[PDB]
Amino acid sequence: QVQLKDAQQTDLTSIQASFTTLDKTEILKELKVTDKNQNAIQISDITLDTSKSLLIIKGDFNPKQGHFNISYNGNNVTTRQSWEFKDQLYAYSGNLGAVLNQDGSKVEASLWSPSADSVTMIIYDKDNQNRVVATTPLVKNNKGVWQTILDTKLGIKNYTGYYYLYEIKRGKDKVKILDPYAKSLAEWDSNTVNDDIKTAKAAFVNPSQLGPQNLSFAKIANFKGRQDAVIYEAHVRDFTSDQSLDGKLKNQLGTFAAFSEKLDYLQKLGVTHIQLLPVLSYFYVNEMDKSRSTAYTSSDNNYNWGYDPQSYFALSGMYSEKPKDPSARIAELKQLIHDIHKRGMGVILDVVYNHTAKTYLFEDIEPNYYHFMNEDGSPRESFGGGRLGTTHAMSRRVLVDSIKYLTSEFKVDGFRFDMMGDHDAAAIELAYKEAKAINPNMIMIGEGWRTFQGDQGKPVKPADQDWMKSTDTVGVFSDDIRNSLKSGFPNEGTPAFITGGPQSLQGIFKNIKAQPGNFEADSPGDVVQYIAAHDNLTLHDVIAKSINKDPKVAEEDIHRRLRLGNVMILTSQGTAFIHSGQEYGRTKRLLNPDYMTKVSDDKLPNKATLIEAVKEYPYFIHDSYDSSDAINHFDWAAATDNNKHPISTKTQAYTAGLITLRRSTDAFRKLSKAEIDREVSLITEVGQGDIKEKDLVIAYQTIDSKGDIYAVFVNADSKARNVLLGEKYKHLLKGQVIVDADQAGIKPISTPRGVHFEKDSLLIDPLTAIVIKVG
């Protein structure tokens, strides 16, 4: 029953051969090894691993005479190079990609592909991307890097704006690939994909020549660390796709250039960093269709969040006014970023190295290497594409080089990693080190969910929530504070602190101190505090679902609860995170006539959540990645029109004032856990007055470096509550109210609403937040 299955070369003198089973003399009989020309190779020794049913074969296996044929009883298999051995032989540290000279007369090009028989560049007309104008063969060096220099010989005087693909030949097969180090691309429409050309085309550009030449990193006032960041998460389309802006907007809707026209709002709002959803090239899109999708739908829209990665260096053409000009988008993003920096803010880019849109994107270039792999060599896959194996040297280069390019070229102030837990901690550490070396004020965050897969049977320390106890570099989202305050996975819509579900106050209090219960944070900067984001139901919609009330009659109550949530996030230690629209009560309700009322299970709308109490239009979208502009647009009237929308504008002014408070004092922005435990204390301890172990009211006190004292009270109960102060906190009765039921800020409120001062206690109205300051 002993039969040879496969084999891999792992170093210069070693080959591992896998068998069906191994249950030494009798096998060094039958086993024979030959080179690429069928010539016999001497076996120095063998070792049997009966547990793994693999045979380790020793000898002199020169890879230049490879690959080797291993044979046993009629089975003949060809050796595959392991990724570790491919790194040993081919790991390259030189320049990759295509570089134009100053006047555009010459391009120096480089592509890494060590297993290729030949590599040919195909060049396409800048003014007609389907028109082939030239082809030229590249030459391979010792590290498997194919190179050429484009010049007058191809009949082209200036290569600027021209497009290119690489045709790689390995034996009988030929395939056309996209330069992974491409700095721009031809206008892209995924409908044009066929069997021959199935990627966008790279473009010849000179990034350094484009955009404002004095582009610099952010200058954020009183920003001394990741704990001082107040991050605002926006999608470039969403932020300016409102029909309300038609006739306002000097630039085209949903572009970098339009986004800049609304930065004053964000400057006033008070956020420090603007986080943009994926601006790098994504696959499922038609960039030549900028039309607004006006019907309320949750599927089959040109709209895309951008989590279908095509390139890690080249920007998407979707947010460019001139997608057919590959230089424009580089200039347009630089200008937006310069406009952000001018207003005292920073920019953070959402980046998606965990997976690609299509496994072939990298697998066509070099097989059995770039992706995390199964033991048979096949690529591990995720979300319809390939899992980038960032423990592998050239895959790690792609991540780190793109982070360095984006940082230094676009002067980016931070990065957010999608599914950071898919990655090894070493790659993200290195990315941080390199980024921080360029930009000393660099900050990084990411989704640290425990999702790691990696290479089969090759465990590695992942960059997830458990990494936080062994690093003070990248911070992770706190799902614990999210869930405890307003629900989330696996139980979205379940009553929680601000939605009528009593929670353990110690757990809430520890979250407020940046000490979540589901992972160890040894520093407050490890924790990104949030209750909403682009994913899942909006804060408004999840509140309405959780309490089961129709916004048509309960708009006011929903916003009272929403404001409590924003108070808690903006007075909690760590890094504060706000979803775009969280400030006004953004909604994703499906206002489609076909879903005026509850429909059958068979005809359910995609990615929608039913709120039973709603009479007309009961479905709300919890995953709007493929939803229309009608669903996804930022509602500017709701955000800024005081007369037409008094409730949402009151909520946004409330949120703006909470941001001012937060930035006004380091009481809410402490550096260490040590000082947090010593200087942030729980007023509502279990047994003080009517406070129970699980409850809906909480109060806490913090002190700043000037020792100024700030006390925050949140009554999330539906009845009034007396909060006991006693001899310990009686000094608070002499303080000034700076946040009440109606307004938030840093100035004393002369006649505060929702609170009454007693002898040694405070009487607080239902669904009311109070903040007192003692100078």
Q: For the CB of residue 657, give the shortest distance to Cl ion in the complex, in Å.
A: 18
- Quick one: what does residue 555 bind among Cl ion, Ca ion, none, with the CB cut-off 5 to 8 Å set by partner type? Cl ion
Q: Which is nearer to Ca ion, 126 or 380 (CB)?
A: 126
Q: Is 486 in the site for Cl ion (CB under 5 A)?
A: no
Q: For residue 421, with 0-12 CB atoms within 10 Å meaning exposed, 13-18 middle and 19 or more buried, which class applies?
A: buried
- Quick one: what does residue 304 bind among Cl ion, Ca ion, none, with the CB cut-off 5 to 8 Å set by partner type? Ca ion
Q: Is 650 in the site for Cl ion (CB under 5 A)?
A: no
DSSP state of 315: B
- Quick one: what does residue 557 bind among Cl ion, Ca ion, none, with the CB cut-off 5 to 8 Å set by partner type? none
Q: Is 399 in the site for Cl ion (CB under 5 A)?
A: no
Q: For the CB of residue 187, give the shortest distance to Ca ion in the complex, in Å.
A: 7
Per-residue burial over 688-697, b if 16 or more Cβ lie within 10 Å, else e, is beebeeebbb
- Binding-site string for Cl ion from residue 539 to residue 558, where x marks contact by CB under 5 A and - marks none: x-----------x---x---
Alpha carbons 167 and 122: distance in angstroms, whole number: 7
| Structural contact between residues 575 and 226, judged by C-beta atoms closer than 8 angstroms | yes
Q: For residue 429, with 0-12 CB atoms within 10 Å meaning exposed, 13-18 middle and 19 or more buried, which class applies?
A: middle
How many degrees, rounded to 5, is the angle at CA 311 between CA 309 and CA 316?
A: 85
- Cβ neighbour number for residue 553 with a 10 Å cutoff: 11
**What is the distance, to the nearest Å, from the Cα of residue 482 to the centroid of all Cα atoms in its chain?**
18
| Structural contact between residues 146 and 113, judged by C-beta atoms closer than 8 angstroms | yes
Residue 629 appears among annotated catalytic residues: no
The residue count for binding Ca ion (CB under 5 A) is 11
Q: Is 464 in the site for Ca ion (CB under 5 A)?
A: no
- Quick one: what does residue 329 bind among Ca ion, Cl ion, none, with the CB cut-off 5 to 8 Å set by partner type? Cl ion
Q: For the CB of residue 376, give the shortest distance to Ca ion in the complex, in Å.
A: 34
Q: For the CB of residue 357, give the shortest distance to Ca ion in the complex, in Å.
A: 12
Spell out the long-range contacts of 605-612 with Cβ–Cβ below 8 A and sequence spacing 24 or more: 605/298, 606/298, 606/299, 607/298, 607/299, 608/298, 609/492, 609/493, 609/537, 609/541, 609/545, 611/544, 611/545, 611/548, 611/549, 611/550, 612/548
- Cβ neighbour number for residue 40 with a 10 Å cutoff: 9
For residue 535 the two structure tokens come to 């994913």
Q: For the CB of residue 326, give the shortest distance to Cl ion in the complex, in Å.
A: 6
- Binding-site string for Ca ion from residue 398 to residue 427, where x marks contact by CB under 5 A and - marks none: ------------------------------
Alpha carbons 687 and 692: distance in angstroms, whole number: 6
Q: Which of 58, 324, 342, 343 is close enough to bind Ca ion by CB under 5 A?
A: 324
Q: Is 704 in the site for Ca ion (CB under 5 A)?
A: no
Q: Which of 270, 448, 551, 618 is close enough to bind Ca ion by CB under 5 A?
A: 270
Q: Which is nearer to Ca ion, 271 or 349 (CB)?
A: 271
Q: Which is nearer to Cl ion, 329 or 773 (CB)?
A: 329
Q: Which is nearer to Ca ion, 318 or 769 (CB)?
A: 318
What number of CA atoms fall less than 13 Å from residue 183's CA on the CB side?
A: 26
Among 447, 480, 526, 629, the active-site one is: 447
Among 228, 418, 626, 695, the active-site one is: 418
Q: Is 304 in the site for Ca ion (CB under 5 A)?
A: yes
Q: Which is nearer to Ca ion, 55 or 521 (CB)?
A: 521
- Binding-site string for Cl ion from residue 356 to residue 395, where x marks contact by CB under 5 A and - marks none: ----------------------------------------
- Quick one: what does residue 328 bind among Ca ion, Cl ion, none, with the CB cut-off 5 to 8 Å set by partner type? Cl ion
The footprint of Cl ion on residues 307-326 (CB under 5 A) is: 320, 323
- Sign of the CA dihedral with 113 first, then 114, 116, and 118 last: positive
Quickly list DSSP for 37-83.
TS-EE-EEEEEEETTTTEEEEEE---GGG-SPEEEETTEEEE-EE-H
Q: Is 522 in the site for Ca ion (CB under 5 A)?
A: yes
| Structural contact between residues 399 and 406, judged by C-beta atoms closer than 8 angstroms | no
Q: For the CB of residue 243, give the shortest distance to Ca ion in the complex, in Å.
A: 20
- Quick one: what does residue 368 bind among Cl ion, Ca ion, none, with the CB cut-off 5 to 8 Å set by partner type? none
Residue 429 appears among annotated catalytic residues: no
- Quick one: what does residue 43 bind among Ca ion, Cl ion, none, with the CB cut-off 5 to 8 Å set by partner type? none
Q: Which of 190, 302, 511, 538 is close enough to bind Cl ion by CB under 5 A?
A: 538
Which residues have C-beta within 8 Å of that of residue 429, sequence separation ≥ 6? 463, 471, 473
Q: Is 306 in the site for Ca ion (CB under 5 A)?
A: no
Q: Which of 423, 560, 586, 633 is close enough to bind Cl ion by CB under 5 A?
A: 586
Q: Which is nearer to Ca ion, 81 or 311 (CB)?
A: 311
490 prior amide bond cis, ω within 30: yes
Q: Is 626 in the site for Ca ion (CB under 5 A)?
A: yes
Stated as kind and residue range, the H or E segment containing 471 is none
Stated as kind and residue range, the H or E segment containing 700 is strand 697-703
Radius of gyration of the chain (CA): 29
Q: For the CB of residue 542, give the shortest distance to Ca ion in the complex, in Å.
A: 23
Q: Which is nearer to Cl ion, 591 or 647 (CB)?
A: 647
Q: For the CB of residue 317, give the shortest distance to Ca ion in the complex, in Å.
A: 10
Q: Stretches 107-115, 189-197, 323-331, 757-765: which one binds Ca ion (CB under 5 A)?
A: 323-331
For residue 50 the two structure tokens come to 């009966």
Q: Is 343 in the site for Ca ion (CB under 5 A)?
A: no
| Structural contact between residues 282 and 359, judged by C-beta atoms closer than 8 angstroms | no
- Sign of the CA dihedral with 600 first, then 606, 612, and 618 last: negative
What is the three-class DSSP state of 292? Answer: coil
Q: Which is nearer to Cl ion, 187 or 364 (CB)?
A: 187
Q: Which is nearer to Ca ion, 271 or 614 (CB)?
A: 271
| Per-residue 3-state assignment (H helix, E strand, C coil) for 625-661 | CCCCHHHHCCCHHHHHCCCCCHHHHHHHHHHHHHHHH
**Residues catalogued as catalytic:** 418, 447
The residues of the shown chain that bind Ca ion, judged by CB under 5 A, are 126, 268, 270, 304, 324, 468, 472, 522-523, 526, 626
The residues of the shown chain that bind Cl ion, judged by CB under 5 A, are 320, 323, 328-329, 489, 532, 538-539, 551, 555, 579, 581-582, 586, 645, 647
